Design a protein around this nucleic acid. Structure first.
Ligand SMILES: [Zn+2]
Lengths: 134, 638
DNA sequence: CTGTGAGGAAAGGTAAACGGCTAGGCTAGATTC
DNA sequence: GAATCTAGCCTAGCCGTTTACCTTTCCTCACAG
């Protein structure tokens, strides 16, 4: 994507790895123009080990966006395969009442498994709460 | 004068003025013999029959032990009522022996439908009829001599069967079918006179000519076809099959003339494709339907909604004029007082005899809704079939008895009655439920499932007749018999299975479960016959195994699928690069013939103008609903 | 070194719905001898 | 009058094809015994 407002243009630096887990970026602002990728790479300790999306790279936003970001969201990905099908669903619950999701690089346009659609949707506005483990 | 005897005003008005004295004379004797007032009123079209029945009745019962009052009244009210009975009192004894073993019902039917002349004609020439060179079974003789105009078809058959069967060349059953209708002598003579001319100049096959001449009113469709085929095929741009279909019904001459007169007017002023006109004019009373459509299309399409497609749908059945007039008369009162949508009324009226169904619905909606507790949707579903009036009248009478004396829910009764011929199914269930439940060990649910289909009465009778023999001598569980008998045409499937199981299981190496799977669908008899005919051809000429043939045939319309596979395997495998497994996969679902034709028609386009490989279109077509996806999801959106 | 949770998508599978044909009966009016 | 020929209108039974509503799979960028 190349469209967004606020004190920043719309582009991300890419890291070609092909190995490892994932590299991602984020662009969020609450009251200042401060923003960074927040060194999000893969899954670590999260208070939701039961939801598979909680260890995927996109789903990690829930933590620190439910806490801080009622605003929209911007992401870019370094895995050129496509957005997992587990996060096409299952992602809408784990945000506040309204938020936005963004696009993946054009390289990840060769999906082989179920789901995995390119140029992911905005992923706006579901109303239920993430469920407590156990 | 007849009021003292106890006749109502309407009954007195029905009787002709000059025959009331005869009723006042022979009323006491008839009442003593056990006749009702309605029977006496009906037995007055023939005044001379009253004295014959009153004086000679014990002899009638002695000669015809099983005869009832209704049969005697029906026989003795026609144009030859007295003389037919007086000949039945003298020929019945000789007609019951050889060569024709005739029962009471056949004698009564032949008398009532043919008269004294037919009775004596059958009595005289029985030896010549049953013997060489004719060799006619008694059933064929009864069928021929049971029409108004008999004693003339028999002599014509005797004189013309060898000539027609030797020179022109026709199967004797074809001649019998031609001669088994009113005015069959004229039909036979006209066929003999006009068959070569129609088969040589106009290029018609003999089967079509026989089909035209196998209807009451022949000798008029053949000459009209001969006169009007070229002008219809040239000026109006039609096809010979359409003309044959138009002329292959009762009064086809009138239909042909009306089509010639009114095709341009309907195709220009109103707006209607010629196919719709042909569909309208392809039923009995076609000219009436055409003229009524021309008269009533604008008013119904403007003042009552009712798009022209619905009007054409209504008018495309036998008696389509009465249905249109009844719809025009009863749409407002039915949609304004009983709370019914116009689509429901159209669905009710789009069947044979829809006027009676509409009248019965108007008469019986409130009583059924407020005395038995039925939703209007249930009544509409009951009344939306052929003969729905009888179904409604039978439900109104037999609902409480079946719901109390047999422990059946109203939903089951509604499901039984919501089918063609549902009047007979309810009576058969009432008669045969205890016997089937006690003497054979069947639950009521199985009986209801057997009876909840078209022709369920025959299915129940066949199940009762054939359950022990199939269960004991062939090693079949009762569940398999129920599964076979559940579908439409269960009697035919059961008979075909009983006839064809051993040779299929022995000469072809098929297991009984495969036969059960083949015969457990609509039209399973045709599938069984086609499999028996085509298994060795498909397994040797082409590379196939019996499992693939069984999979193809284990579906609705398996005969068509098998024939289409046989026709289209080399064409698809030698021009489009498809392996036989893929062709089998395409054809192993419902509507497989259409799927194969669509794939053949649409593969080049989807391969040269959309960027799709063959395996992808095969995968789309391999699932149920292949024509819809290939024809309107991948070929119209782009 | 091979087998585990939440959440709406597509996809097999049986039944219900929607068309069209064939065989047989009964009544009223017209036509021929 | 005595027999026979023509048109319409109603009930049952059988054979093919398309559509609406349930239920059994498939999906990782994680990890444990
Ligand atoms: Zn994911």
């Amino acid at each position: 994507g190349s469209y967004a407002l606020g004190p920043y243009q719309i582009s991300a630096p890419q890291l070609p790895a092909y190995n490892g887990q994932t590299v991602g970026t984020f662009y969020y602002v609450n009251d200042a123009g401060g923003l960074e990728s927040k060194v999000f790479i893969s899954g670590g300790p999260t208070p939701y080990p039961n939801y598979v999306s909680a260890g995927h790279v996109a789903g990690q936003s829930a933590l620190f966006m439910r806490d801080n970001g009622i605003s929209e969201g911007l992401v870019f990905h370094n895995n050129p395969k496509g957005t997992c099908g587990f996060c096409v669903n299952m992602i809408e619950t784990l945000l506040p009442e309204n938020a936005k999701m963004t696009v993946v690089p054009p390289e990840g346009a060769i999906p082989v498994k179920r789901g995995a659609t390119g140029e992911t949707k905005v992923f706006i506005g579901n109303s239920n709460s993430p469920k407590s483990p156990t | 004068d007849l009021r003292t005897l106890g006749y109502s005003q309407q009954q007195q008005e029905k009787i002709k003025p000059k025959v009331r004295s005869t009723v006042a004379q022979h009323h006491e004797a008839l009442v003593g013999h056990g006749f009702t007032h309605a029977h006496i009123v009906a037995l007055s079209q023939h005044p001379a029959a009253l004295g014959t029945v009153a004086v000679k009745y014990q002899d009638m019962i002695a000669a015809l032990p099983e005869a009832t009052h209704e049969a005697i009244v029906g026989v003795g009210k026609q144009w030859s009522g007295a003389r037919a009975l007086e000949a039945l009192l003298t020929v019945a004894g000789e007609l019951r022996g050889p060569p024709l073993q005739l029962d009471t019902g056949q004698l009564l039917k032949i008398a009532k439908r043919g008269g004294v002349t037919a009775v004596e004609a059958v009595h005289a020439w029985r030896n010549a009829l049953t013997g060489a060179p004719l060799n006619l079974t008694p059933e064929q003789v009864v069928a021929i001599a049971s029409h108004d105009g008999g004693k003339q078809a028999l002599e014509t058959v005797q004189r013309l069967l060898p000539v027609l069967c030797q020179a022109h060349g026709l199967t004797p059953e074809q001649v019998v079918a031609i001669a088994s209708n009113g005015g069959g002598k004229q039909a036979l003579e006209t066929v003999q006179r006009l068959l070569p001319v129609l088969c040589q100049a106009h290029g018609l096959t003999p089967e079509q000519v026989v089909a035209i001449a196998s209807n009451i009113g022949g000798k008029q469709a053949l000459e009209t076809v001969q006169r009007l085929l070229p002008v219809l095929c040239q000026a109006h741009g039609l096809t010979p099959e359409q003309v044959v279909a138009i002329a292959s019904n009762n009064g086809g001459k009138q239909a042909l003339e009306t089509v010639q007169r009114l095709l341009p007017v309907l195709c220009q002023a109103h707006g209607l494709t010629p196919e719709q006109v042909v569909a309208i004019a392809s039923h009995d009373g076609g000219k009436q339907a055409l003229e009524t459509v021309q008269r009533l299309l604008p008013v119904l399409c403007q003042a009552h909604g009712l798009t022209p497609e619905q009007v054409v749908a209504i008018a495309s059945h036998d008696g389509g004029k009465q249905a249109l007039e009844t719809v025009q008369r009863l749409l407002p009162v039915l949609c304004q007082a009983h709370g019914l949508t116009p689509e429901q009324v159209v669905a009710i009226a789009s069947n044979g005899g829809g006027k009676q169904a509409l009248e019965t619905v108007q008469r019986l909606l409130p009583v059924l809704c407020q005395a038995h507790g039925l939703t209007p949707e249930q009544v509409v579903a009951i009344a939306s079939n052929i003969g729905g009036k009888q179904a409604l009248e039978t439900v109104q009478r037999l609902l409480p008895v079946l719901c109390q004396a047999h422990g059946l829910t109203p939903e089951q009764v509604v499901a039984i009655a919501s089918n063609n011929g549902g009047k007979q199914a309810l009576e058969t269930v009432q008669r045969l439920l205890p016997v089937l439940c006690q003497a054979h060990g069947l639950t009521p649910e199985q009986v209801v499932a057997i009876a909840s289909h078209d022709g369920g009465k025959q299915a129940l009778e066949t199940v009762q007749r054939l359950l022990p023999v199939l269960c004991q001598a062939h090693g079949l569980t009762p569940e398999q018999v129920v599964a076979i008998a559940s579908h439409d045409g269960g009697k035919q499937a059961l008979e075909t299975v009983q006839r064809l199981l051993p040779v299929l299981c022995q000469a072809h190496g098929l297991t009984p479960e495969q036969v059960v799977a083949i015969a457990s669908n609509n039209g399973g008899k045709q599938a069984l016959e086609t499999v028996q005919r085509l298994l060795p051809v498909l397994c040797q000429a082409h590379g196939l195994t019996p499992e693939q043939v069984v999979a193809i045939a284990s579906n609705g319309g398996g005969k068509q699928a098998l024939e289409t596979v046989q026709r289209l395997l080399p064409v698809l495998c030698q021009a489009h690069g498809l392996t036989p497994e893929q062709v089998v996969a395409i054809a192993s679902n419902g509507g497989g013939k259409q799927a194969l034709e669509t794939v053949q028609r649409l593969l080049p386009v989807l391969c040269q103008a959309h960027g799709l490989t063959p395996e992808q279109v095969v995968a789309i077509a391999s699932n149920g609903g292949g024509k819809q996806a290939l024809e309107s999801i991948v070929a119209q959106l782009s």
